[PDB]
Design a protein around this ligand. Structure first.
Ligand SMILES: [Mg+2]
Ligand SMILES: [Mg+2]
Ligand SMILES: [Mg+2]
Ligand SMILES: [Mg+2]
Ligand SMILES: [Mg+2]
Ligand SMILES: [Mg+2]
Ligand SMILES: [Mg+2]
Ligand SMILES: [Mg+2]
Ligand SMILES: [Mg+2]
Lengths: 151, 140, 126
RNA sequence: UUAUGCUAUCAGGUGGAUGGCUCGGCUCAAGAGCUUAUGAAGGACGUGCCAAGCUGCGAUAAGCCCGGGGUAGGUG
RNA sequence: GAGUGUGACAGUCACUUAGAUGUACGCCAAAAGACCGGAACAUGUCCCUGAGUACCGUGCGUUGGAUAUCGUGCGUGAAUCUGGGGGGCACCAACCUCCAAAACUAAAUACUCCUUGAGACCGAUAGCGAAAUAGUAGGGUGACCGAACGCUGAAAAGUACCCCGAGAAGGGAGGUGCAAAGUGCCUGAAACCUGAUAGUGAUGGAACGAUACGGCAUGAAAGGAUCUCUGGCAUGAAGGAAUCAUUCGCGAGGAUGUAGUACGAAUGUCACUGCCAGUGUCGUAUCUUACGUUUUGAAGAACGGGCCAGGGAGUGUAUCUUGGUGGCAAUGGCUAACCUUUUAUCUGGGCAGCCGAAGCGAAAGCAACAUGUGCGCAGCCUUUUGGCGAGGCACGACGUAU
RNA sequence: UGGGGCCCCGAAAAUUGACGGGGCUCAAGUCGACCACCGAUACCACGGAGUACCGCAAGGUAAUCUCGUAGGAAGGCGUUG
RNA sequence: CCCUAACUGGAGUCCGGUGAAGCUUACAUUCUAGUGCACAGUCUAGAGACCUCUAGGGGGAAGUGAAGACCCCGUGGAGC
RNA sequence: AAGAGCAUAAGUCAGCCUGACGUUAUUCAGCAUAGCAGUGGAUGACGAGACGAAAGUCGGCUCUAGCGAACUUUUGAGCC
RNA sequence: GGAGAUCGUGAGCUGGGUUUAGACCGUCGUGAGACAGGUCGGUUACUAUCUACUAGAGGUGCCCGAGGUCUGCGGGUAAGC
C-alpha cells in the first residue's frame, strides 16, 4: 500500500500524542499505575543488563504489564503454529532511546517490549494493529531529538 | 467485483447465463467496430475516424511558459522575500529569465512599479506594465 | 436526526468531524438556531464537495470586521486587506499566515460556537 | 407373532470424509556458479550371511587408505 | 522469552538461542622493493593515418523510422589533411560537430541445477506428478502419457495359558494397555448392508410436506413451575345475538323495542390441577403435479442428477473513469528509479518528471474578468414583510480560430 | 297473418366416461324479481415485526408503507489466517 | 406355403456351487376422459384395486443405448 | 410519382437581368416522446447585385424525392 | 365395405422402396459436383426395473376348529355365423 509522507507523519504524530493520553493507554489492555507521559532521564541509555531494566520498570510502575506480556503469552490456534507462529504474543513496553546505546541490548529481551531509537519510530510501534495507546517509555534524549521529527 | 454478494444468485448480476461469454458480448475487442456498429460510441468517446493537420518537429517547436501580470504584481513581495527579485528605488526589479517563465501576459491589474525583463511581453502586458510606471526590457 | 443522517454520520471516519456534527445539532437544538443545524448538514455532505475557500473570495465579498464560517479548508490563493474573522474546519498554512498578517482571527467551529452560540452575524461561506 | 414392507431412531458391518498432526511442496529473497578424452553426466549389469525395491558402491563393489572434528557405540 | 524434542501448555530437562571461539587447503590483500617509461615547447611548399570500404542505384526483409531505421542480394564505387563524414527528402552556402571502414576492456545487469533464510502460501482429492521402494506401478511400436498409497501405543507392554477348529486360519475364555488404538491399527461421517426398538400394516392412492386436531411411544440433561389442565370474578376493541311484544310484507322474511343488552380477541387477578412445550410414527380435515435450467409458457411425453462424501467457477498486472473516507493545497500535489536496512518492514532523503497553474489554432503565431451588472436558496438581520446574501443561475466584457 | 320465449327435427367417429360425479322434472333446468345464509391473507379491530421520512433524544407520522424475475443499493452470518 | 405335428441334441424351467453389467430425482396397484407447451401412473372428476411370489412373451413407461448423421443457424471449419 | 398550394396568381406572354451569388449562426426533422452520421429546409446575419415608383421579391425551376463517411488523388484563393 | 388405434403394431418380424458412403445411364454445370430422374449393391443394438395382460402358487382378511355339498354379488361368450 502507500501513504503520502505528510499524512503518514500526521498519523505518526497522532500516535505519539496518544501515548500521553491515560484513557487510551489504559484502554489498550496496558496495566500500569504510572502517570503519563513516562519520560526518563538519559541514564537509561547506558544500563547494560536486563535486571536494571526490570528495576526501572518496577520503579516506574510498569512491570505489571511486562508480567502480563510474559505470562499471557499463549499458544495460538490453527495453521499458524506449523508455519512458525506458535505463540500469540502481547505488547507491553516501548522504550525510545535518543541514540544507539546498550539499553537497546538491555531491554531487548523484555517480554513483549520493543526498544527503538527515535529514527526507527514507525507508527506500528506507536500503535500496533491500528489501535493507538502503546505504553511507551521515552527518555530526555528522545525528547530533545523530537522537535522536528515528523514536521 | 463483490464476489461474496453474488454467491447464490447463479448469474452474478449478469442477467441470462448466456451473457458474459467472450468478445461477442462486447462487440469485438478493443475499440473495434467504430465504423459499423460502434459509430455513435466512437463519436461519444472520441474514436471517430479521420486525420487532421500536421506536426512540426519537437526539436524546433517550443512551448513557452507564461505568467500573468496579476500574478507578478500580487506576489512580487514574495519574490523579494524569496530572493528571486529585489527592490530598487521603490520599483520591484523582477527578471523572468531565472524564474523559468519566458512570456508575460496582461491578465489582471498592475499597481506597483515593476521593472520586468523577459524574453517577450504581450502587447497588453506591456500596456499594463507601462501604465503603472514600470518598464519592459527584452532580455537575451 | 434520522436514519439517513445516521448513515452519513457513521460513514465519516474523522472523530473530530463526527463530534462537530453531534455538538452542532445539539447547539441548534438548545439555542433554537438553524445556523448550527445548517453547518451540521453541510458537514454531513460528501467530503469530496467540502468547501475550500481561497483568500480572494473572502477579500472580494466581505467588509470591515466580518464574521465568516467556512465548512472546509481556507486556502491561500489571493490577498487580504482588512480584518476578517474566519471560523473554518481547517486552514492552509499560507492562508493562516495571510490572515494573521492581515490582523484577522482564525478559530474553529468549536471556538466560534463557544464565543457566541447564537450565531448572529455569521455569514456562511463556501 | 401381520409375512413381504414403510418411516424415525439405536447397535454393528463395509467405508475412509471431517477434525488433529506432518521429515513434503510452492513462492520470494541472499549467496555461489561451470564440468568433460587424467574418459564426465546418463544408462546396462553386478554388488548385502539371511537382501526383492530404492539408495550407495564397481570384481578392493551399502566399501579401502591417510590428516582434522567427535567419542561410545556402529552394522542405510 | 527464536524455536524443536520431551509420555499434555517447557526461558530454567536436551538440542539450543544472544554472544564468543577454532579453522588445513584455498580467496582477497595493503606496507616494503625490482621492472619499461612519460609530458610539453618551437619547427616546416616534408611524410603516414584502415577499400571492392564509406557512399550511390535497384530488390527484398526488418523497424516507430515516415522521400528521414538497420540488415544484405545484385550492380557501381571514391578522396587522402589544400582530406573525409554527420547535423531525420536532396543540392548550394554559412555555422556547429566528429575521424569510420582493425582490436581489447572490470563494475553496475540477467538466470537458478545448487546453498541458506523467510512466508496472512497448501495441509494430503490441497502443495511438485511424486510427504518420493515416483517419472515409479501402468499405457503406447514410437515420439510420449502417467497414478493411488501418510498416521498403533508413552513404552511392543504386538496378546501368556486353556477350549473349539484339520488348521501357525479364525472364534470363545483370558490377559497387556488410562484407552484395543488388536498390525494401511488416531478420531471413524454419510451412501450401502445386517439386527433391535416405536408407530402403522396384507380395503389400499402417490411430489412423501405445510397448517389444525387426536391415538401410541418418549419427554434424564439442556425448556416452563402462576408453567400445564379445569373454572369464577373485573375491564373488554371490531362484531352482536337467542327469546318475547308490536307492525309491515302475497311469501321467504324485514323494521322497531328488548339492546348496542347477555356475549365477544385480549389484558389482570383468585382458586383448581400436574402436566405442557418439544421429539418419533400413524390417522382425520384443507392446500400443494419435485428441484435447477432453456422457455412467452415446465410436473412435462424438454434438458441435468442412482445415492453419499470431498474438490469445483469474477483472480492479477497495466491503463482510463467515478463514488466514500482522508492528507496536503496556487507560496500547489506526489514523488519514480535510487541512497540509508541495524536484512525485504521502517526513518530521513531523492525536484528528474507527471498533473494543476491559459487558452485558441493544423501551424506560424497571439494571449484573457483578482466580479461591470440582474435575480436569488441556505444562512444572518428585521416593524415577519422586506434587507444583506457565500455557493447557484443569467448577462455583459475580454483572449484566440474561422 | 305478423312479432316473441323455450323445446324439437336438421344432428354420423372411431379404448368405456364425463353437467366436475351422483342424480335432478310445479326442478337440483331456463326466464323476470326477491329474501336469508355461507364464503378470502380483502375490509374492520386488537397485539406484534420490519421499513420510509422527521426529531438532539424520548419518540412522531404512514387511508395516502409492506407481492415480486433481470438488476441496482444497504446491513448482517460463516470458513482460514 | 395350405397347416402344422411328432422326435433328437444344446439352452430355458427346477436344484447345488460360482457370479457381473446396462436404464435409476422421488413416489409408484392402475383404467377412462378432460386439462396442461396442444401425446399424463402422479394434476381434475370418476371407476377399479387385499398383499407377496413364480413362469411367459413384449402392449405402455413418448423403454435403454447417443449433446441428431435429415433441415436451419454460426460474420465455426476442412477437403475439392 | 403521389398529395398539397396558386387567379389583378405560384399560370401565359413580353422588357430588363443572372439571387442557379461568396461567407456565416441557429432551430428543425431524417431520428415524435428520446441519443444517432452527410445531408436538407425554415428563419436570420456580413458583402455584393438584378428587376421595380416604391413596398417588396429573388440563396434556382410552387412545397415535399433526384443522392454518399473516413482515407486517397486532383483542382481553386491565400497563407502556415 | 370404408375408416380409426403415434398414417395401430421394427425392446414382434421383414427390408422390397425412400434417405448415407461405391458405380453406370441421361440431363445440367468450364469444373468440383447436382437431379422432387432411372438402374445395380448396401450392418436392424438391448440379460425387462415398474406397469398392463396371461396362467400357476404362498399368506393374511372373513371365520367356534376342520371337512364336504351348494348358492350366486359379479365377470365372459359368436358359441355359433
Ligand atoms: Mg443482450
Ligand atoms: Mg534461549
Ligand atoms: Mg498430491
Ligand atoms: Mg425468462
Ligand atoms: Mg464441498
Ligand atoms: Mg434481484
Ligand atoms: Mg445438439
Ligand atoms: Mg452475423
Ligand atoms: Mg413395439
Amino acid at each position: 500500500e502507500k501513504v503520502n509522507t505528510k499524512e503518514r507523519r500526521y498519523a505518526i504524530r497522532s500516535a505519539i500524542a496518544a501515548t500521553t493520553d491515560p484513557t487510551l493507554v489504559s484502554l489498550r489492555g496496558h496495566i500500569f499505575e504510572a502517570e503519563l507521559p513516562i519520560v526518563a532521564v538519559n541514564d537509561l541509555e547506558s544500563l547494560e543488563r536486563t535486571k536494571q531494566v526490570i528495576e526501572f520498570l518496577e520503579a516506574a510502575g510498569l512491570y505489571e504489564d511486562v508480567l502480563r506480556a510474559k505470562y499471557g503469552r499463549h499458544i495460538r490456534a490453527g495453521r499458524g503454529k506449523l508455519r512458525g507462529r506458535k505463540y500469540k504474543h502481547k505488547k507491553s513496553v516501548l522504550i525510545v532511546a535518543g541514540e544507539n546505546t546498550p539499553i537497546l541490548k538491555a531491554a531487548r529481551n523484555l517480554s513483549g517490549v520493543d526498544v527503538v531509537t527515535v529514527d526507527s519510530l514507525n507508527a506500528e510501534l506507536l500503535a500496533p494493529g491500528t489501535h493507538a495507546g502503546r505504553l511507551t517509555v521515552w527518555t530526555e534524549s528522545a525528547i530533545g531529538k523530537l522537535e522536528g521529527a515528523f514536521q | 467485483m463483490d464476489t461474496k454478494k453474488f454467491r447464490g444468485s447463479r448469474t452474478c448480476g449478469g442477467g441470462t447465463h448466456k451473457n458474459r461469454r467472450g468478445a461477442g458480448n462486447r462487440g469485438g475487442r478493443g475499440k473495434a467496430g467504430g465504423c459499423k456498429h460502434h459509430f455513435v460510441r466512437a463519436m461519444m468517446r472520441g474514436y471517430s475516424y479521420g486525420k487532421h493537420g500536421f506536426k512540426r518537429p519537437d526539436e524546433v517547436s517550443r512551448d513557452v511558459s507564461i505568467v500573468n501580470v496579476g500574478e507578478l504584481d500580487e506576489l512580487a513581495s514574495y519574490l523579494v522575500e524569496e530572493g528571486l527579485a529585489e527592490v530598487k528605488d521603490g520599483a520591484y526589479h523582477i527578471n523572468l529569465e531565472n524564474l523559468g517563465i519566458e512570456k508575460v501576459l496582461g491578465s489582471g491589474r498592475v499597481t506597483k512599479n515593476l521593472v520586468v525583463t523577459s524574453e517577450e511581453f504581450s502587447a497588453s502586458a506591456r500596456e499594463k506594465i507601462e501604465n503603472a510606471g514600470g518598464s519592459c526590457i527584452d532580455a537575451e | 436526526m434520522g436514519k439517513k443522517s445516521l448513515v452519513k454520520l457513521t460513514r465519516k471516519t474523522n472523530p473530530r468531524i463526527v463530534s462537530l456534527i453531534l455538538t452542532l445539532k445539539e447547539r441548534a437544538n438548545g439555542d433554537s438556531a438553524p445556523i448550527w443545524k445548517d453547518i451540521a448538514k453541510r458537514l454531513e455532505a460528501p467530503s469530496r464537495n467540502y468547501a475550500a475557500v481561497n483568500i480572494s473570495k473572502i477579500n472580494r465579498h466581505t467588509a470591515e470586521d466580518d464574521v465568516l464560517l467556512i465548512p472546509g479548508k481556507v486556502l491561500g490563493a489571493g490577498l487580504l486587506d482588512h480584518p476578517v474573522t474566519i471560523a473554518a474546519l481547517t486552514f492552509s498554512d499560507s492562508a493562516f499566515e495571510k490572515i494573521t498578517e492581515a490582523g484577522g482571527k482564525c478559530l474553529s467551529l468549536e471556538e466560534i460556537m463557544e464565543a457566541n452560540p447564537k450565531g448572529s452575524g455569521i455569514r456562511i461561506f463556501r
